[PDB]
Amino acid sequence: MGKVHRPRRGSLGFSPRKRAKSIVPRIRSWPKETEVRMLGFAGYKAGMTHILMIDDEPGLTNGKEIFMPVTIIETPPLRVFGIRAYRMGYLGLETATEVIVPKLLERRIATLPKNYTQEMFEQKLGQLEDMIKEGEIVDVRAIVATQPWVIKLKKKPEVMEYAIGGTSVEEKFNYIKEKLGKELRVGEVLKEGELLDVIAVTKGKGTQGPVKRWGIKLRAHKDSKGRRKVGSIGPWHPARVMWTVPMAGQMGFHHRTELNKRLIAIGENGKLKLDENTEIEITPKGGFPHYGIVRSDFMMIAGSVPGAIKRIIRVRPAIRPPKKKPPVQRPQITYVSVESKQ
Amino acid sequence: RGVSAVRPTRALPVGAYLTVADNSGAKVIQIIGVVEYHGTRRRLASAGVGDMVVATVKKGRPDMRHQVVRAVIIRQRKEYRRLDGMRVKFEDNAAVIVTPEGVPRGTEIRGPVAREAAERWVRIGSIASIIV
Amino acid sequence: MARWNVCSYCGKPFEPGTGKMYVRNDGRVLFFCSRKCERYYFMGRNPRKLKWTKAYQEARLQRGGE
RNA sequence: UAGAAGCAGCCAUCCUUUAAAGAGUGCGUAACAGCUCACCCGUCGAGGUCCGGGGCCCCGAAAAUGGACGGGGCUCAAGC
RNA sequence: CCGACACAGGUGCCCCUGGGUGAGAAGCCUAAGGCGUGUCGGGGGAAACCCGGCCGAGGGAACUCGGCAAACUGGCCCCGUAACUUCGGGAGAAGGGGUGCCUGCGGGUGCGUAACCCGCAGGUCGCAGUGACUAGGGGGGCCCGACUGUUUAAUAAAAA
RNA sequence: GCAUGAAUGGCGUAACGAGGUCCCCGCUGUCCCCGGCCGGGGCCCGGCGAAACCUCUGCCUGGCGCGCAUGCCAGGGACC
RNA sequence: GAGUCGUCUCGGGCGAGAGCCCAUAUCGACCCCGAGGCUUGCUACCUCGCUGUCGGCUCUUCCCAUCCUGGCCCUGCAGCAGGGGCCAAGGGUGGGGGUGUUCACCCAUUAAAGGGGAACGUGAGCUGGGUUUAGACCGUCGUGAGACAGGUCGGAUGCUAUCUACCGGGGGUGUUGGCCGCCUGAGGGGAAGGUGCCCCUAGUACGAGAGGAACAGGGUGCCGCGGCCUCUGGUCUACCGGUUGUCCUCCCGGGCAUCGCCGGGCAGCUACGCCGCAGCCGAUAAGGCCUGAAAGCAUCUAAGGCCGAAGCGGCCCCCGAAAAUAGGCGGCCGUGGACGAGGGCUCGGGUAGAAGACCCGGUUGAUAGGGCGGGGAUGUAAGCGGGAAGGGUCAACCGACCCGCUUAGUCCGCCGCCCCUAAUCGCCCGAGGUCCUGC
């Protein structure tokens, strides 16, 4: 070459690529640690559709038409089945105690008493003790579960943790407490027009090539033996192979966070109530390819979402606001679509 | 540059032949490169619409040809994506020779010319027989 | 804007944010529904002549009827 | 030389008188004027400023898998 | 047979009257005739990647020592053809146009309408009539050896 | 003309060429920038079955050393 | 390669000298002293029972004496714009034309188109163009055979990974007796961001004028990376339709020409498609200073103290109970030759998927399949009726083709309804509250 600087192909900012250790998304940012309500609301991705909206954010100047794809998701109502208490140790955060509170319970693979009533009352009393002191406790988080039963993709509860914020430890405890005996809403935690993060384990390709994972540029005039091979891997010394070099192995089934997708619309059904703005509750005829009946609470969120069709996705509020665009409270939907995916 | 107000599609690299739609006496212009572009290893400089392009005259009179000139590319054969989800696609690729200021060489540009170009350089829209 | 449009190769109702507009060398515009409609214009075929064109058929049957 | 009046520049650089004065250190003026120093007496009421050897420690001192005092680590020493 | 071998090798004659096809002892399809021992099978959304092989927008060699490799023309019939020339040739230069099917006629050979061959007109379908298979991309300049032939069986087919 | 020359043939040459060199036009995934499909493999199973070569070991980094080390020496990683 | 450092590259000290004047705005001789291993050469240490050359291609690591971006200082800095100096490898540093070419020359772009080491990185990765063998010609020289750091044409790139490395996937123990689910965050990694333009500022500051900045706010592009196909483009040997040859007498319906060819295209996979990818703060460099002495003053430092980089950390993104400090919580369990909690194999499918695993459903059931309707792909069917150039003994009719029946037919990797069919039937492996101690 001639010492030609070449930018890296693949990344180390996302590498390694491998299988997720749980099908529950991972979290290392908490946007509702000191603030009420859960970290968004979880559903199953129905599919996608598209919608035409009016600026909103200026494409050129405000008042012009913009195209936007939107991912329509059947969410179940969620319901608190467990209270988690923490005590802060000296090696990190450690689990004080828990209350566990109960055919879906049967489909779940999780362990079951066998003296339900008894165990539950002891954990509950234990918790009141912890709550009183009150500074033992430094934060409280909620074990929360999905409830699929009108949804055909899977019917087992996927069980996850979301924190429940509050100003102080006693307040988080009261809020969480009211919640166990109840259902929950897309409406209660979240509202239209915030920018929100999306967390999901992306679609599994299975094992894929250097061509696919890292990208491999093509070569010279004619190549007898292939153009999809690895080339050099390295010198004579280093005497060992690195990990920064093109290989084949897993792509997908990896957890990904994509930031800041604007919340367009909330409703319920779909296609059993017809509105002229905020989306017409867009449900394709012939149904969605490879996905079960829709009829429950839903949300249609902007742009892309990590996760292909038929996969449990989770939503988290944002860890940053937009930074040269203004937020818009309540997006505007100029005209609608009713297209088929067929 | 300027305000383009279109979602980008590019697909005309170095060595491309584009038609000269203005009277100037240069029949063909060939693209050298795209003005204000940052290129990377193994990647030929790709050209969208609306761009100020540096080019040589590939065919024309000896007085137009072996000259290094600037032009602004009006049309391309390749499909273009608006922001509104509707697509633009012209039957041919064309460029009009243009001075670096924005002001066109030739006293008329014939056919449509891109709206993204119009925003970016006023005089090209003003001269234009239609702006599509 | 809130625009709606109608194909000029069949007369069929046509969605917005979808299709291609093919713009003439003279500047006129032609709305194509889908890739088939575009591919067929190039061929120079008469969609009328064929029966895949629902509106074209329909008209003729009606014109029969009168 | 219009001006060269310490102060464009050249050379000389002399004499009287003293808190104190160099045919003037720098500023300033077109050149003067004007501002000012070295200098001095006196107050502060002391030991004052220097220069010159030596020993040491600093600066001088930029490199490519993690390589360095054998390693860890060590600054009233586990250093000289 | 012969190659140690049941090694895709490689060795002469005749079948050159099979049909359709078409100029062909041609291709492809289908017989007569032969075989299923061209001597391991079964399974798997069958991933990566490799060996044969198909299609790719926009651009038109930017790739590379070099268009190498592939692409492309294409069959057939007519028209038309430059520099140069030893007047033979260059030449299928270059470049243009037609070609299916059905229905009615003419010429030619024959024998009495049997057996054939070569054209014409009208009607007419498709995105496409050599529609499959079969099937040359073209042009010029410079150097060398005139040519056809021959050479390192088995890295060198050349300016030798 | 570093270091041409007339049958150890010179100059030129129509026609010819799986000869060497160069340019153009058409064409084109050779490339920008990659993707999908087809057949044989791959992978798995039953049966059938070699070869190359073979002092021994889960290594890495430096130093050293016949100056280009797994084994020495000092570090560092280490469940199979 | 090691050794070596004359040669080479680069630095420091001294400052002759010109820059109108003024050595240092800038340029800088004579001479003297180091550093590096990057050119050249020396060494004969290592290999001749081989350590294969150069260049390109592809793929990656590291270094700074840093081309650009950030932060800074001077000026013979008016502005615009240069010149010179300091920090700094986080990121970027391109495409073409000639040469086999590393190197070098050239064109136009660019914020800039930085260099060097890694077996002169990279041939058990490619290529084999160049060094280059056995064939040949020419120039020079030779009696001649024959030679050439002269020119030139053409002239093989082997190997099924044993060991070990790295990237991905399983099976088990340790796991303080086992177990099911949920978490903690030791650490490891990163560039997830980089960069440029335009308008407003402003025809302003500044300038005699010509000419012409900056802070800050908006819009857009480019590159890298990651994800995603509803739009649009590719493909699609699901399927459907048109069609040549030939075979089945044959309409119908099919085979083959190794999808026959051509035309359309759904799901799915992709870009030539779409969407996403912060700030601030703390501590610091270079720098600017405060107080303030050594030297009663002055002085940014000698101590104390205030700010201040694209660099450093947090913040952010990726992985992470085999972290032996082997972790936490909650629940479930035991207690040949008794009994048997968890768990697999089984079955129907995948959100999954090379084997395996993973995930879900299993009559308490909509999981798959049939049937039926819905949604989609092709584009007008079998059969029948009329027309048809003409031809006829003028009738039965022979007829490519046309129109109606029929927006039909064929087909579906998609949806609902529905227990109709198949989710049946059954097999196993794993304990025995445990030696002392805490209880």
Side-chain angles (χ1 to χ4, degrees):
Chain A
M1 291 174 187
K3 305 291 181 174
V4 178
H5 307 93
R6 186 167 87 266
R8 53 158 183 204
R9 308 280 295 191
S11 62
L12 297 164
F14 289 109
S15 291
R17 277 161 294 216
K18 51 174 291 89
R19 275 188 183 170
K21 65 187 179 196
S22 288
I23 188 83
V24 178
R26 182 176 69 70
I27 287 185
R28 63 170 309 288
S29 284
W30 294 74
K32 299 288 194 61
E33 195 48 68
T34 198
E35 179 61 56
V36 290
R37 314 164 296 169
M38 295 305 175
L39 292 61
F41 206 68
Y44 311 105
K45 166 153 174 167
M48 313 185 79
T49 45
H50 70 291
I51 192 60
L52 290 158
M53 288 211 291
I54 187 180
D55 290 5
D56 301 350
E57 300 173 67
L60 58 151
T61 183
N62 304 284
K64 299 291 176 44
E65 189 178 71
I66 200 158
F67 180 104
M68 186 58 77
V70 271
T71 310
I72 175 184
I73 301 172
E74 197 190 9
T75 67
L78 294 172
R79 157 162 193 150
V80 189
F81 286 115
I83 295 187
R84 176 166 288 191
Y86 284 88
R87 46 162 186 271
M88 178 47 178
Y90 42 105
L91 279 160
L93 289 161
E94 295 185 304
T95 291
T97 41
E98 198 180 293
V99 195
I100 56 152
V101 183
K103 176 72 198 202
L104 320 184
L105 287 150
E106 172 170 337
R107 280 154 178 173
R108 205 166 60 161
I109 55 176
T111 200
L112 291 178
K114 310 198 166 187
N115 293 303
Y116 237 140
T117 53
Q118 300 293 319
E119 310 300 298
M120 182 268 290
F121 309 158
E122 303 166 306
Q123 292 176 64
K124 201 69 176 60
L125 189 42
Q127 173 264 299
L128 304 152
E129 305 314 291
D130 276 6
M131 184 170 64
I132 290 152
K133 297 199 182 59
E134 74 172 76
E136 197 173 71
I137 312 306
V138 289
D139 53 315
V140 173
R141 290 197 195 149
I143 320 308
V144 189
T146 60
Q147 302 193 74
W149 50 279
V150 57
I151 322 182
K152 293 200 174 174
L153 99 168
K154 54 190 77 175
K155 308 161 190 288
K156 215 195 79 186
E158 319 298 298
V159 193
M160 57 283 169
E161 171 160 92
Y162 279 132
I164 183 55
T167 303
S168 282
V169 291
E170 175 66 58
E171 274 173 74
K172 309 177 177 64
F173 275 129
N174 288 5
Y175 298 148
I176 205 187
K177 201 182 293 178
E178 278 189 283
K179 291 170 177 64
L180 296 163
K182 215 189 287 189
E183 313 296 291
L184 291 69
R185 294 296 72 168
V186 183
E188 192 174 302
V189 45
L190 282 170
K191 67 194 86 173
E192 289 166 51
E194 213 162 317
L195 292 292
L196 316 162
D197 286 356
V198 261
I199 45 174
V201 175
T202 66
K203 102 178 192 294
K205 281 76 72 173
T207 54
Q208 286 272 261
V211 196
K212 296 103 179 13
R213 285 172 64 170
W214 307 80
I216 295 299
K217 311 297 295 105
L218 296 177
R219 286 172 181 147
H221 205 186
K222 184 182 187 299
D223 285 63
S224 314
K225 309 293 170 171
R227 303 203 186 86
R228 288 208 303 174
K229 296 193 298 323
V230 288
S232 182
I233 289 160
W236 190 63
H237 284 306
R240 47 160 166 148
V241 181
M242 311 180 212
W243 72 301
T244 57
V245 279
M247 276 290 182
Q250 271 282 102
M251 186 177 196
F253 206 84
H254 43 49
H255 164 242
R256 286 287 196 266
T257 307
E258 301 209 70
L259 305 153
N260 303 304
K261 322 286 178 179
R262 173 70 57 88
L263 208 187
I264 317 295
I266 307 177
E268 189 154 48
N269 308 135
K271 221 59 177 309
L272 286 170
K273 143 148 50 70
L274 298 186
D275 293 288
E276 295 297 298
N277 289 18
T278 323
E279 326 200 44
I280 184 146
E281 314 203 325
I282 312 170
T283 298
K285 58 215 158 283
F288 290 95
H290 302 281
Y291 184 70
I293 183 60
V294 165
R295 171 64 195 95
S296 273
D297 281 289
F298 65 91
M299 64 195 275
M300 315 173 81
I301 202 173
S304 51
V305 166
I309 197 165
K310 209 185 168 283
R311 293 177 71 96
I312 162 160
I313 58 92
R314 298 201 292 153
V315 171
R316 193 160 74 187
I319 63 190
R320 71 275 300 256
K323 298 293 192 171
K324 216 188 183 182
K325 320 300 294 186
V328 175
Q329 292 286 68
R330 273 79 186 165
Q332 290 191 87
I333 298 72
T334 195
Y335 193 57
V336 297
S337 297
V338 276
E339 79 296 297
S340 309
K341 290 185 92 289
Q342 315 289 280
Chain B
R1 293 187 271 222
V3 179
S4 182
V6 283
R7 298 311 302 163
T9 308
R10 312 165 81 92
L12 280 182
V14 177
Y17 308 109
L18 323 161
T19 51
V20 186
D22 62 298
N23 52 108
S24 54
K27 283 186 294 301
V28 175
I29 208 170
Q30 182 189 240
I31 186 167
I32 296 174
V34 167
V35 186
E36 292 161 358
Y37 182 73
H38 304 307
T40 49
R41 179 74 194 200
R42 269 303 184 99
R43 176 168 279 265
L44 308 184
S46 292
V49 172
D51 287 60
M52 186 55 98
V53 289
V54 64
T56 192
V57 171
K58 188 79 175 53
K59 309 194 184 292
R61 299 303 320 125
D63 297 317
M64 293 311 315
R65 180 192 91 216
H66 276 196
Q67 308 294 290
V68 168
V69 291
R70 258 79 166 290
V72 164
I73 175 174
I74 71 177
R75 273 178 299 163
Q76 63 185 211
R77 203 183 191 282
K78 192 57 186 311
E79 57 182 39
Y80 226 90
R81 175 66 166 195
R82 298 183 48 216
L83 72 172
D84 76 326
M86 292 309 299
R87 306 198 70 112
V88 194
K89 195 168 169 68
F90 301 103
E91 295 174 77
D92 59 4
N93 15 244
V96 158
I97 329 178
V98 169
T99 63
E101 292 80 68
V103 181
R105 329 182 186 178
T107 51
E108 192 56 34
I109 299 183
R110 290 163 298 226
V113 294
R115 68 189 191 79
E116 54 192 300
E119 287 171 71
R120 289 184 158 165
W121 310 103
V122 172
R123 283 56 60 191
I124 303 174
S126 306
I127 200 156
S129 33
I130 193 167
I131 318 180
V132 180
Chain C
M1 187 168 293
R3 53 190 292 182
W4 184 67
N5 298 291
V6 192
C7 191
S8 64
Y9 199 60
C10 38
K12 292 184 194 66
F14 176 41
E15 276 263 293
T18 286
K20 181 174 296 177
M21 287 192 311
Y22 208 108
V23 187
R24 301 282 94 170
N25 272 347
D26 283 284
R28 322 186 303 272
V29 312
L30 283 85
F31 276 96
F32 300 128
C33 190
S34 59
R35 178 66 187 193
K36 196 170 169 185
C37 293
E38 184 177 351
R39 286 207 172 162
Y40 278 25
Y41 185 88
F42 301 161
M43 290 145 201
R45 305 146 178 284
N46 297 119
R48 55 187 175 70
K49 194 177 59 164
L50 314 181
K51 303 172 85 176
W52 86 278
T53 315
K54 300 291 89 174
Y56 323 144
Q57 277 189 284
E58 192 180 41
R60 288 175 299 161
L61 309 181
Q62 205 169 338
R63 285 179 271 125
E66 296 181 48

